[PDB]
Amino acid sequence: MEFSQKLYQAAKPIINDIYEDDFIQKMLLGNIQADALRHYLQADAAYLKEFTNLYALLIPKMNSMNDVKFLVEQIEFMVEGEVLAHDILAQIVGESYEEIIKTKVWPPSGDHYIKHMYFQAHSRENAIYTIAAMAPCPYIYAELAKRSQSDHKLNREKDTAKWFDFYSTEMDDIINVFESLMNKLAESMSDKELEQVKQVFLESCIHERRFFNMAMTLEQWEFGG
Amino acid sequence: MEFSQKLYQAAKPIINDIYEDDFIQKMLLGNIQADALRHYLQADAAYLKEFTNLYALLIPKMNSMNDVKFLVEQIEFMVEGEVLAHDILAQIVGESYEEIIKTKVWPPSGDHYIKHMYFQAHSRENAIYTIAAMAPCPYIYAELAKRSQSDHKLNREKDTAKWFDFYSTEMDDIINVFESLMNKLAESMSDKELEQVKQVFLESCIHERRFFNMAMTLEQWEFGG
Amino acid sequence: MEFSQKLYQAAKPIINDIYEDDFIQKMLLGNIQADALRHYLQADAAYLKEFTNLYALLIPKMNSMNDVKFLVEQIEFMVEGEVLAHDILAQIVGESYEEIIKTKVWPPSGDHYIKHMYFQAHSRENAIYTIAAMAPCPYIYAELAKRSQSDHKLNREKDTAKWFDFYSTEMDDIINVFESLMNKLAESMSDKELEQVKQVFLESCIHERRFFNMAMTLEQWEFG
Amino acid sequence: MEFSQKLYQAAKPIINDIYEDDFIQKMLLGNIQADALRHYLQADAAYLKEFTNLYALLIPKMNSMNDVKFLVEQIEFMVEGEVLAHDILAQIVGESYEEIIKTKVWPPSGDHYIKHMYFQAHSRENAIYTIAAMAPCPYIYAELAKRSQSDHKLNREKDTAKWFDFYSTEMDDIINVFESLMNKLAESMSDKELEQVKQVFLESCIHERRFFNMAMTLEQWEFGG
């Protein structure tokens, strides 16, 4: 089949394991406590400028200037603020998004996620490796949202369900762009080369699951005992 | 004086030699040949993708987000593809700009300039070294155009003068941005480091002279001995 | 004090947590399972090529040619074997070393360690970060093994105590080298920068603990 | 024919020009003077460390450990000193090597060459780009020195002949290693990629021609006018 779809098939048991894990399950039935959600926000904000830096590192890896335009736009979007799914999470805790992130966290998981992406952008000439590393989302985020709407255990009464509504639609653009690039780039690559890329993708897929478990566990570096 | 003013000071003897070299001189009188203008644009257009790359690499070196927005504009400006001074040089040869750059050339002088800038981007952590490599591009051009306005040898009947009129104004805004970045970053640096930075800036000055001269001499790699 | 001692002082709680984790405690008593030694040997041999690359990447960052002569020797060392601590460990499983490492393993824990190191080699001009990131390795192994020599729990009637005897001694030259380097580089640096270097150091300390813990827990990527 | 021979055959007209240029000719007759020799020795020493760094950066791009054992050996040889050709040259300037290189110079021609090799080392994942950039150096010297043995203008009464006698032999091992690495690595590559590798190699041949020239002309960065 097509390469990006080969990725999606391998990613199934993980999105499955992410869906049945504690973050998603708890978001689903409305019972998720504002402490876990605080950890998730502070970290996302903390790694913000890293994501910005990765798109810019993608630019010299490009060829078509149409793809460069898009990377500018994604860099543009993040600096331009306006995080909608974040204010829905800000609602559930009941404090503003900006006030929560005045404190920041750099947990061992986010650190592991960020350096996985950076290793690809520093060590690997072909863009597909960086791109495969940043792709597992919002692909994962979208697929979770769609499993939500069909699911009858979904709690629609609370403000947890407005999170799922966001990722069902608004992630779908950049998924296609990443899908185009990866599929286009894989045409000339060998089977051995492509197995690496897939591994890059699936490691990132785990990093998402670990990122949610990080939020739930209030994870940090323990240097003091 | 401010650190960047010491840089301008040092640059004067070179900026002078450039002004007195055949390119600008033959640009002043308006007698310059479509030969050299063709070579000039072709080299410059082949290096278009490379300058887009350099503004991208500077982003992860930027600690201030207003600095990042600036670098973003320069990429957008390069993606939009509006080159005013180039369309001016095109009509003098009498072909459209797209026809001329359909053929590209990649001369030694230009190779050395590019590789100099990439060396900073690639191996130097501090954004001051790359910027200092890039700065003598909009400064020198503005300075020559400003000299030509008070010069009685400037032939105002010829269309070559429109080129000068463009560079006496349109470069001013980006210079000051490079000027503020350089001056800001030099504050925390040892005097010896600044001796390196100054060296980097001065080589670029030299490459500008060499680039112009390459167009006059229709320079290229001769591998055929 | 010197900067490197400041690093050693902060590394203490972590080193203690490592000593009281399962790997060292079971290494002391002799009763450590062969599953874990197996995973430890394979994860360590899979990451060998990476450690080669990191010393190599430190060379352009050096100035002195004596520092270079050192980095060269460590790679010349790594080529050859002289894996005597590992030669000892393979006797405990009862398979030969070469037979064990025929299948390499590539655990998430190691992955995070390696990439943390590489990050320094790739993104930081000054060598001190990449050195800070690799320094916990000899220093931690040394300390734990020094501790074992004053510790009555250690079973000298099992072959596992030969591990500690090796690491009580044979790391000491490379620790001094590293110690010189960090101390000399720190002189010219601000307090803020050294706050980052210390953080890089302590993370590898943590990575060291997770490396051990991973052999114990047979850690791997579960894609299925 | 094997890939490296395609390279060797293309290098011929550039090697012939280098042979006919002033440095080698004056080396031949023995009338080359201390000025140019000193400048050659100074530039060469000044770039040692850099050529040393490059071997190191080939390591992470290496597949097997025997290629690494070689690279280590190269760095091991540069650390230990023992420059036989350089001592032959120092005798002619009538001084000691260590005295001559106490003063160092980094001329434009040298700078361009160095930045050419580093560009390959920083931006190109595949080892073949960096090796092809470094391969012309030993190879050219070998070819030059072998040609002198059949040349009756070779002045056997001056120690300049010992300079050729050395390069006629002592470069062969490393040439052969590089030849094996380039052949092996080329097998997996498209013809289009190989055209770029050939371009790097030939660019390095030209740089060799300019390095000798820079020495005869006492080249330096001219910032003063």
Two structure tokens written together for A169: 């639609």
Torsion of CA A215, A218, A219, A220, to 10 degrees: 130
For chain C, list residues whose CB is within 8 angstroms of any CB belonging to chain B.
Answer: 60, 123-126
Q: Which residues contact C100 (CB under 8 A, 6 or more apart)?
A: C38, C41, C42, C90, C93
Angle between helices A191-217 and A136-149 (to 10 degrees): 60
Q: Do A116 and C119 touch (CB under 8 A)?
A: no
Residues of B in contact with D118 (CB under 8 A): 115, 119, 122-123
Please indicate, yes or no, if residue C79 is contained in any of the structural domains. Answer: yes
Catalytic residue among A143, A179, A205, A208: A208
Half-sphere exposure of B31 (CA within 13 A, CB side): 6
Quick count: other Cβ atoms within 10 Å of Cβ A78? 15
Give residue A13's Cα distance to chain centre: 17
List subunits contacting chain A, requiring 3 or more Cβ pairs under 8 Å. B, C, D
Catalytic residue among B143, B179, B205, B208: B208
* Residue of chain C with shortest Cα separation from D75: C72
Catalytic residue among B137, B143, B205, B219: B137
DSSP class per residue in C86-125: HHHHHHHHSS-HHHHTTS----HHHHHHHHHHHHHHHH-S
Task: Give the integer Cα–Cα distance in Å for D63 and B168.
Answer: 54
Residues of D in contact with C59 (CB under 8 A): 52-53, 56, 75
* Residue of chain C with shortest Cα separation from B123: C125
Task: Give the integer Cα–Cα distance in Å for B52 and B7.
Answer: 25
Query: Measured between CB atoms, which of D203, D205, D224 is closest to B13?
Result: D224
Task: Give the integer Cα–Cα distance in Å for D134 and D113.
Answer: 10
What is the 3-state composition of chain A as percent helix, strand, coil, each rounded to the nearest 5? 75, 0, 25
Task: Give the integer Cα–Cα distance in Å for D31 and D160.
Answer: 9
Two structure tokens written together for B208: 């500008």
Q: Residue A22, annotated ligand binder? A: no
DSSP class per residue in D118-183: HHHHHH--SHHHHHHHHTHHHHHHHHHHHHHHT-TT--TTSTHHHHHHHHTTTTHHHHHHHHHHHH
Tokens 């073949």 appear where? Answer: D128
Tokens 């280590």 appear where? Answer: D72
Active site residue B137: yes
Distance from CA of D126 to the nearest CA of C (A): 15
Residues of A in contact with B57 (CB under 8 A): 56-57, 60
Distance from CA of B97 to the nearest CA of C (A): 40
Distance from CA of D202 to the nearest CA of B (A): 7
Give residue A97's Cα distance to chain centre: 19
Task: Specify the DSSP class assigned to residue A170.
Answer: T
CATH of residue C181: 1.20.910.10
Distance from CA of B112 to the nearest CA of C (A): 22
Closest CA to D56 of C76, C74, C57, C73: C57
Buried b (16+ CB within 10 A) or exposed e, D44-74: bbbbbbbbbbbbbbbbbbbeebebbebbbeb
Task: Give the integer Cα–Cα distance in Å for C210 and A210.
Answer: 15
The amino acid at residue D31 is N
Closest CA to B202 of D40, D225, D216: D225
* Residue of chain D with shortest Cα separation from A127: D125
Catalytic residue among D137, D143, D205, D219: D137
Two structure tokens written together for C75: 């790679």
Task: Give the integer Cα–Cα distance in Å for C57 and C47.
Answer: 16
Query: Measured between CB atoms, which of C10, C119, C222 is closest to A223?
Result: C10
Helices (H), C157-219: 161-167, 172-186, 191-216
* Residue of chain B with shortest Cα separation from A54: B60
Q: Which residues contact C82 (CB under 8 A, 6 or more apart)?
A: none
Give residue B77's Cα distance to chain centre: 16
What range defines the domain where residue D18 resides?
Answer: 1-218
φ, ψ for residue C6, nearest 5 deg:
-55, -40
Distance from CA of A69 to the nearest CA of C (A): 26
Q: B71 by DSSP, 3-state: which?
A: helix
Residues of A in contact with C13 (CB under 8 A): 223-225
Q: Determine the Cα angle at D78 with ends D73 and D80, to 5°.
A: 95
Q: Which residues contact A60 (CB under 8 A, 6 or more apart)?
A: B53, B56, B57, D123
Tokens 């040298």 appear where? Answer: D110
Q: Residue D151, annotated ligand binder? A: no
Helices (H), chain B: 3-20, 22-28, 34-46, 48-57, 65-80, 84-93, 97-100, 108-123, 127-134, 138-149, 161-167, 172-186, 191-216
Distances (CA, A) of C138 to C126, C143, C168: 21, 9, 10
Q: Do B123 and D123 touch (CB under 8 A)?
A: no
Q: Residue D94: is it exposed, middle or buried by C-beta count within 10 angstroms (0-12/13-18/19+)? A: exposed
Distances (CA, A) of A152 to A145, A155, A168, B39: 13, 8, 16, 69
Task: Give the integer Cα–Cα distance in Å for C200 and C182.
Answer: 13
Task: Give the integer Cα–Cα distance in Å for B77 and B89.
Answer: 19
**How many contacts (CB atoms, under 8 Å) link B and C?**
8
Please indicate, yes or no, if residue A156 is contained in any of the structural domains. Answer: yes
Q: Do C206 and A225 touch (CB under 8 A)?
A: no
Contact C108, C205 (CB under 8 A): no
Contact C30, C157 (CB under 8 A): yes
Q: Residue D167, annotated ligand binder? A: yes
Number of domains in chain D: 1
Q: Which helix (H) or strand (E) holds A12?
A: helix A12-19
Task: Specify the DSSP class assigned to residue D205.
Answer: H
Task: Give the integer Cα–Cα distance in Å for D160 and D91.
Answer: 10
Closest CA to A210 of B124, B212, C111, D29: C111
DSSP class per residue in B79-95: HHT--HHHHHHHHHHTS
Distance from CA of D189 to the nearest CA of A (A): 11
Q: Do A108 and C112 touch (CB under 8 A)?
A: yes
Two structure tokens written together for B18: 């450039």
Q: Give the start-end residues of each E strand in A90-215.
A: none
**How many contacts (CB atoms, under 8 Å) link A and C?**
62
Distance from CA of D113 to the nearest CA of A (A): 23
Interface test with D, best of A59, A62, A125 (most D CBs within 10 A): A125
Q: Do A14 and C223 touch (CB under 8 A)?
A: yes
Task: Give the integer Cα–Cα distance in Å for A200 and A42.
Answer: 26
Please indicate, yes or no, if residue C109 is contained in any of the structural domains. Answer: yes
DSSP class per residue in B6-42: HHHHHHHHHHHHHHHSHHHHHHHTT---HHHHHHHHH
Please indicate, yes or no, if residue C90 is contained in any of the structural domains. Answer: yes
Task: Give the integer Cα–Cα distance in Å for D79 and D56.
Answer: 13
Tally of residues, chain A: 225
Q: Do D59 and C72 touch (CB under 8 A)?
A: no
Two structure tokens written together for C44: 């360590």
Quick count: other Cβ atoms within 10 Å of Cβ C33? 15
Please indicate, yes or no, if residue C168 is contained in any of the structural domains. Answer: yes
Contact B100, B34 (CB under 8 A): no
Q: Residue A154: is it exposed, middle or buried by C-beta count within 10 angstroms (0-12/13-18/19+)? A: middle
Q: A13 by DSSP, 3-state: which?
A: helix
**After what residue numbers is chain A broken, C–N > 2.5 angstroms?**
none
Residues of C in contact with A206 (CB under 8 A): 108, 221-223
Buried b (16+ CB within 10 A) or exposed e, B53-76: bbbbbbbbbbeeeebbebbbebbe
The amino acid at residue C77 is F
Task: Give the integer Cα–Cα distance in Å for A19 and A6.
Answer: 20
Query: Measured between CB atoms, which of B13, B108, B112 is closest to D223?
Result: B13
**After what residue numbers is chain C broken, C–N > 2.5 angstroms?**
none
Interface test with A, best of D59, D124, D125 (most A CBs within 10 A): D125
Q: Do A10 and C111 touch (CB under 8 A)?
A: no
Q: Do C52 and D72 touch (CB under 8 A)?
A: no
Experimental structure resolution, Å: 2.7
Q: Determine the Cα angle at A185 with ends A182 and A191, to 5°.
A: 95
Helices (H), C3-160: 3-10, 12-20, 22-29, 34-46, 48-58, 65-79, 84-93, 97-100, 108-123, 128-134, 136-149
Distances (CA, A) of D12 to D19, D24, D137, D144: 10, 16, 14, 11
Please indicate, yes or no, if residue C67 is contained in any of the structural domains. Answer: yes
Task: Specify the DSSP class assigned to residue A60.
Answer: G
Task: Give the integer Cα–Cα distance in Å for B108 and A144.
Answer: 54
Please indicate, yes or no, if residue B223 is contained in any of the structural domains. Answer: no
Buried b (16+ CB within 10 A) or exposed e, C84-103: ebbebbbebbebebeebbee
Residues of A in contact with B65 (CB under 8 A): 49, 79
Task: Give the integer Cα–Cα distance in Å for D93 and D38.
Answer: 7
Contact D24, D18 (CB under 8 A): yes
Contact C110, C179 (CB under 8 A): no
Distances (CA, A) of A34 to A1, A94, A218, D207: 43, 8, 11, 65
Catalytic residue among D143, D179, D208, D219: D208
Two structure tokens written together for D105: 């110079």
Give residue B122's Cα distance to chain centre: 20
